[PDB]
Amino acid sequence: MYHHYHAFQGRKLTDQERARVLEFQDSIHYSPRYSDDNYEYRHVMLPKAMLKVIPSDYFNSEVGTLRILTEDEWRGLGITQSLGWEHYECHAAEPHILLFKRPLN
Incomplete structure (x- = not known):
């Protein structure tokens, strides 16, 4: 039996980081x-x-908001949504607020 594979896009958390965030x-x-x-x-x-407990390379150091995150990155933080949702940055929004859009088709 076999399964298929996905290669992580972005900067994968370490095990120690993963446990903290989760x-x-x-x-x-x-x-x-x-x-x-x-x-x-x-x-x-x-x-x-x-x-x-979010690693510092995930932050936009200039502003303090999180940087634009890849699907694999935001999902790895424990954010569980369906597929195709795309993160977009907002310098004025509070750091803990993450905004997402997805095309209908």
């Missing part, structure tokens, strides 16, 4: 989705306390 998995808040005629949208809120 301690807060159940505190993560998922907004209901809204949409317009092109896009579906959702926001995700990390507990403020989770910020202290």
Whole structure:
């Protein structure tokens, strides 16, 4: 029997990092989705306390928000959404607030 493989895109957490970040998995808040005629949208809120254990290379050091994250990266933080959701940066938003859009088709 065989399975298929996926190669991680982005900077994979270490085991020690993974365990820290995943301690807060159940505190993560998922907004209901809204949409317009092109896009579906959702926001995700990390507990403020989770910020202290996210590796520093995930942050935009200039501003203090998280940097644009790849699917594999945000999913590895324990953010569980379906496929195709894309992270977009907002310098003015509080660091724990992550915004996502996906095309309808």
